[PDB]
Amino acid sequence: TQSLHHSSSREALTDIIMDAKIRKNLTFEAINEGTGLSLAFVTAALLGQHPLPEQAARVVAAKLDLDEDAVRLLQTIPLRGSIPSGVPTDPTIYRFYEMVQIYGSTLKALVHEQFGDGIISAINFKLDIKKVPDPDGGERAVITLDGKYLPTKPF
Amino acid sequence: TQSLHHSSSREALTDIIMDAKIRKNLTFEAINEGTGLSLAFVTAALLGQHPLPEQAARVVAAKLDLDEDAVRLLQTIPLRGSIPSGVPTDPTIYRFYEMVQIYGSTLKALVHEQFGDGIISAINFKLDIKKVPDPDGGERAVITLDGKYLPTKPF
Amino acid sequence: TQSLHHSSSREALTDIIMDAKIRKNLTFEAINEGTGLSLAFVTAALLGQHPLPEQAARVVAAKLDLDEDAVRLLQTIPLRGSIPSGVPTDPTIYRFYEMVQIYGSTLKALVHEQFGDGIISAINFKLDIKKVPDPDGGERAVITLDGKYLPTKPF
Amino acid sequence: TQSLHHSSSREALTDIIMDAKIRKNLTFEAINEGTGLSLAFVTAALLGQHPLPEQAARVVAAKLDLDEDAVRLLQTIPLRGSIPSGVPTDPTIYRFYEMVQIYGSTLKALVHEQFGDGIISAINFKLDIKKVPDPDGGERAVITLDGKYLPTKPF
Amino acid sequence: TQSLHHSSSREALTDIIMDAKIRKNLTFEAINEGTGLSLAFVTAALLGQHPLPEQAARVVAAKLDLDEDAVRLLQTIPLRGSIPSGVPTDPTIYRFYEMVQIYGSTLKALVHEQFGDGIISAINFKLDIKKVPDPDGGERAVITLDGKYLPTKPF
Amino acid sequence: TQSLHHSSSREALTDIIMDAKIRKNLTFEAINEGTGLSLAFVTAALLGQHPLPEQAARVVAAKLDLDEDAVRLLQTIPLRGSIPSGVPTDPTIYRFYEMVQIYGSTLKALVHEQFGDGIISAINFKLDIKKVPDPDGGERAVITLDGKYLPTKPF
Amino acid sequence: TQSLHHSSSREALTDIIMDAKIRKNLTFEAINEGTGLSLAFVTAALLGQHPLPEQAARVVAAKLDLDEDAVRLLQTIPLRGSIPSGVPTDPTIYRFYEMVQIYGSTLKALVHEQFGDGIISAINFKLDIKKVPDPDGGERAVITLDGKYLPTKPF
Amino acid sequence: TQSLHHSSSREALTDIIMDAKIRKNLTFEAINEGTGLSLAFVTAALLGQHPLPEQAARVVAAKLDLDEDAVRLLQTIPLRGSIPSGVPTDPTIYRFYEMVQIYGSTLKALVHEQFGDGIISAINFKLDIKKVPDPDGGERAVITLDGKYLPTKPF
Amino acid sequence: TQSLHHSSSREALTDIIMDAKIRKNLTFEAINEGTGLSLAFVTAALLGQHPLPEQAARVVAAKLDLDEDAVRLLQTIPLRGSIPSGVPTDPTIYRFYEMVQIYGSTLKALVHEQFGDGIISAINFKLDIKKVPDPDGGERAVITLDGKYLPTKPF
Amino acid sequence: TQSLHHSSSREALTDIIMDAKIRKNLTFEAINEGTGLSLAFVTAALLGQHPLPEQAARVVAAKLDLDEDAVRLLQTIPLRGSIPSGVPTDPTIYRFYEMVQIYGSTLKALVHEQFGDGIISAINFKLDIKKVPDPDGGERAVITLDGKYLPTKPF
């Protein structure tokens, strides 16, 4: 599978994608209709973090009026990473980084307690975000991280 | 409420906690028996990231054979942060960081799309981890991030 | 709501805004005349840190002779962050960074003493700057940070 | 006036002060009784960021049961800086850092618009934090930053 | 399984281990006799990067005259990371870092071409080093990185 | 031998090479046809990390429709380095960095035990990656680092 | 007064200024002939670190054949900072950085001894450089830093 | 001359020097009585940045009641540097760093204009600090940097 | 003497210089013919690290067919520094950094022993590299660093 | 050969070495009597950067009155690196770093011109420093770096 060596080409496309998305006043959910894939995956791809299968690449390119060059580049594996600074400054992204900063030691401790030595995978991995009401007024976001346990065993 | 200016004295207590835990071969779940609180919160408190209410601090110090000085220190608010390096080197913790590194801009975009401008809070926030079977053989971790949406409104 | 994956397209608009502002010899106060919003919020929005509602975006656009593409982009939520390096070199901004560096631990200590565990929010939050006379001669700036207390409670 | 060349010897006193404070269940407000100085300044001094005049040093040393060496060290000017990393990990401190990250360019812009070229001082400067009720439920912190304007004039 | 929250308790043991090794003039191969484990894994464990099963912990402890406290700690999962700076200064370690700096983009490209999107695991993974002669005089090291391919598939 | 002072010019050529590669749907193995050189070396050269001999340079230029300016720049020694950030964010690349992070001290210890004082060369060095079917289902990557032992030695 | 949010716009003007200065073989002293201001202040302005008053900006524009847009931009307050890297690589600039690196703690100690707690201002501040003969042959630079003392007084 | 390889033994001595100086309530000017050397040089030596000739070392040790070990250590050349973080956080020291930050490019430009290519030395160099009254009220510090010009000539 | 403010206009010339040297397949020694200056100085100047006297500037300009704007710019003093990252990643440059990293404290200790307190100058300094045969087959590089000794004397 | 995992144990020995050296008023040259090794290698070993053969280790220990444990520690391979900050602040060391900063790209260029692709090794490497007179008065240091050329050949 084709892969990218640098972010520059996939970043240029992402700017074009965002330009068309705003110009047409489209939501990611609207862009994702007809892909057969999850919104979180296709939104990540459009923001340059995943390749798309051909059918998904052509349906988003149809809604955004993108040409064939964009369809080919959407199918290429990018050089991944949404936070080049390592630690974000944007408050929305920072809160998610802060969750890991606070509970990082706890998540390691409980993973080792309930699963054993090793990791929870970030590749054999799926992500979901859901809007639920708050019983005391307002809304909450439930973000589900679903990762395979990979054990570390002596060899 | 009493607060700490540094992480060191709470780190010294954390070292005493982990030593007693290893010496007694105790799980965090067993230590959490009878607190009335979530295992994620209490484990984080033991690892120096949270204060404990008095009843929970006494019940943990009783299991770990800790003195009254530990009881008072467990009730003090710490200077928080489980990853002083900013980005972890430990693979288990790094995977959670990588989840944010990869999906950080996607989470921002989808939060703004489904909620609006603002953030998902990391303070009005609860964390949970559950072990589920993998349909293709193996174990999976389902980590749930549950935060309040705080809107950014023009003023 | 429309969001921006990175700030350079908003940076380019910010460059155009500042260029029009200098050429027309305009103050932010004059630009803000018909927005119906606070000068602090709208100046930040012009500098790429906030979106504007449509009608407020149109009134700064009429002042600065910006086109409809600028009106659409001004309404988009940016990737926030006004200090790229994390630490400013500019003396004016640095003094505000220095206030946090000097009194940061005091602010935490007194928040915990007077409110309890948790944070003062930087999202449910309003900023104001006011010029007052100095009794000994000269002028002083009174900057008001007004943030909601969000408690950290055991769960 | 006596001054210090490093953080360490003042850090050791700050550790002793915080240890005695927690062991005696004292608030910073109770420690500040009789000093004739503001809670924000004295709290900062106890946390290593300011010297205290002799009478203030003796009354906090009596309340905390500190010896004559502590009185002298409390009157010494420290090497200042409450955030050694430059960027805090603690959420309570981080929020104030975030306020500067977001509004830093705005603060500079309005300082130059409303005052002129130059800075708002961080030395000819006072800080206050006040707890007020939020009209819609809860509490808010009103943090006031009050600094002298120092002009930059051509020479 | 017991885990550790930071380096120091294993760091202290690692120094004790190294001190005894140098005093007894032992090789890692000699220390590893009878464990049934690979020399690279056990050496890594002794250097504080892996836990050991009880049999291997008691075996290495017998060869180094370590007490039962060391046996228990050698069975605990450490906070992993052998290069705290992230980039080493030691030339011997730096050469392996240089290999990744030079061929990093190549390995990504060839992994995606030959395997597909995804990663080569560093957890489902074993390391080996072998000494072979150089056909033009001298010796060469053959280091084998053996990791499981984890695909990234659209979801 | 001609060498480049920066990454800029060689980066522009890599963009053109990757664009031609994606457009023609070519593998690095297809581009490597009839060069007589290993796929890892030529791929690294195409990615701007090595110069190519004129014959190989003309071969891959023919298959990618590159002009004589590309033939000449492919023969120049670049300013090497594939990971500008020092630590990668891309998960595929990061896994290889993590192997050095975890096992770096072990590789140093075993190099010194099995060879002596000195280094395993990153210059007198060849890399190879092979796909090896994994026994438990799936595939494994066996990556071999083959470097010459260069002794460090009193003088 | 008009202010700038980024370094680049004045950076472009500085490049224009330097290009015109080199083409005309002018010294900063010649350019400063009719400004009515100090050489050190005006040179810093031309290098993008200060605004010029209107009549002084028109003098330097006449010497350098700059247009009215340059005159306007020269009167805008910049985002200040001449060493974006924080520490310079240039040897001429580095020597001044090194004087502060070496004598920084001494300057603090003697400021506190001779003035009291507080700072020597960098805003109420003038700089001067003078060339004097060295008694042992050669030349010396005498750089004078002249800053107002701002006390830190308890409040 | 005896030189020091790291800060620590000179660090500990500096701690002892400052401990005795505060306990005796001494000034650096009093400690410097009878050295025949400048206050800035001797203060920097006490702060770990310079060696002292034996007779100067013995008189500062006699004022502080230090032993013969301190006298020998004071004569050794330290590993120099008063700001280990590269950029200071202390406000008094930061102002001098900011001076170089703002005027660094101006100093280089006027050195090359008035002297030529090369540097103003930080080694063939003297520093002086002087307190003078401000005509408008208050006090000012006049810091003199006096360095030899060393040219860069083509060779 | 004409000086520069930033790297880029001289960087643009260095790109043009390097582009012409590759297209003409010239060596630096060939470009240096008839300059009267050493290859090490003129190579550095062509790489943007030094100014050239006018004759040397016109000579290299005729060799690479550059205009009079390049001749004048080549006579300007640049903002020096060949490694913007501070630490190189290119292996060829890194080895020279490694030499200082490994032997830096030794050079300091031996400079102080054989010369005294102070420095070996990097400005009153000449560099030379020569190729010599290795008695065991192959070739060695003998790089000579020739710097004036500048003493640090008490003042 | 025995090797060490961290710098601390050898750092403690280096501290003891320097203490005895200063206490005995010894030069590195006098400590190096009878080793049959060059001053630069043994000095670096004493500073924790190289191991010593048994005989050389015993002679420096007899000169410095170190015990048998120091003789064994002196024979172990350290974790190398004399500049933990990456870039030194000490002026004597910084000058040598500045030589590479300035001439780094020149050294690479001339190495590739005179030798070919590849490196000049820092392991098959010898360093020397000699004091020669300056024809204009004073002394100069001639530091010779003698490294084997290792080519990068296509494979």
PDB file of C-alpha atoms in Angstrom, chain B residues 10 13 16-17 52 57-58 60-62 64-76, chain D residues 23:
ATOM      1  CA  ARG B  10       3.196  12.431  48.402  1.00  0.00           C
ATOM      2  CA  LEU B  13       3.951   8.061  50.782  1.00  0.00           C
ATOM      3  CA  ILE B  16       5.444   3.340  51.200  1.00  0.00           C
ATOM      4  CA  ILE B  17       2.058   2.331  49.789  1.00  0.00           C
ATOM      5  CA  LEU B  52      -9.128  10.552  49.696  1.00  0.00           C
ATOM      6  CA  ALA B  57      -8.182   7.086  53.744  1.00  0.00           C
ATOM      7  CA  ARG B  58      -8.600   5.226  57.041  1.00  0.00           C
ATOM      8  CA  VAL B  60      -6.819   1.945  53.017  1.00  0.00           C
ATOM      9  CA  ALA B  61      -4.324   2.778  55.758  1.00  0.00           C
ATOM     10  CA  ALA B  62      -5.813  -0.071  57.787  1.00  0.00           C
ATOM     11  CA  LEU B  64      -1.740  -1.276  54.274  1.00  0.00           C
ATOM     12  CA  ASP B  65      -0.860  -0.844  57.984  1.00  0.00           C
ATOM     13  CA  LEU B  66      -0.185   2.892  57.603  1.00  0.00           C
ATOM     14  CA  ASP B  67       0.033   5.408  60.429  1.00  0.00           C
ATOM     15  CA  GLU B  68      -2.125   8.433  61.211  1.00  0.00           C
ATOM     16  CA  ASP B  69       0.359  10.669  59.372  1.00  0.00           C
ATOM     17  CA  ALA B  70      -0.388   8.726  56.199  1.00  0.00           C
ATOM     18  CA  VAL B  71      -4.118   9.129  56.874  1.00  0.00           C
ATOM     19  CA  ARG B  72      -3.831  12.923  56.987  1.00  0.00           C
ATOM     20  CA  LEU B  73      -1.511  13.064  53.953  1.00  0.00           C
ATOM     21  CA  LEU B  74      -3.862  10.860  51.905  1.00  0.00           C
ATOM     22  CA  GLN B  75      -6.570  13.482  52.546  1.00  0.00           C
ATOM     23  CA  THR B  76      -4.444  16.341  51.189  1.00  0.00           C
TER      24      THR B  76
ATOM     25  CA  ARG D  23       0.188  18.535  60.842  1.00  0.00           C
TER      26      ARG D  23
END
